[PDB]
Amino acid sequence: NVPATPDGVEYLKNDPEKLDAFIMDKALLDYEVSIDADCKLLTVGKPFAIEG
Amino acid sequence: GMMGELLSGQADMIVAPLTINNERAQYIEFSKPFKYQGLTILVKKEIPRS
Ligand SMILES: N#Cc1cc2[nH]c(=O)c(=O)[nH]c2cc1[N+](=O)[O-]
Secondary structure, X not given: OOOOHHHHHHHHHOOOOOXXXXXXOOOOOOOOOOOOOOXXXXXXXOXXXXXX | OHXXXXXXXXXXXXXXXXXXXXXXXXXXXXXXXXXXXXXXXXXXXXXXXX
16 A cells, blocks of 8 residues: 555655556646656556546 | 437337447437447558567
8 A cells, every 4th residue: 555645656656666666546646657757657558447 | 219219109219339429318318338438450461570
């Protein structure tokens, strides 16, 4: 687990160690990649399990 | 067609794709959508080798 989404990204950001993958709404995990010039992160795969 | 038959009076549940719409949501009543549709594109095979 991770106690918080910013904590999650930072915890992944200890490159390359620790985590290698993550799961969360695809409306925070797109903002969280839409501020980095180096664009070290990216979104892949097929969405599933809709939610409003 | 299908919508017309519904609004006639002798049908009750249009179990089919229905591509919900702004204005189409007055003379009928919808529910929570259960898939996502959008107009996409395909192109001919463009995967050769080197
Ligand atoms: N599948 C499908 C499909 C579903 C549709 N559903 C609609 O409600 C409509 O107006 N046009 C449609 C057209 C298609 N179509 O032929 O691609």
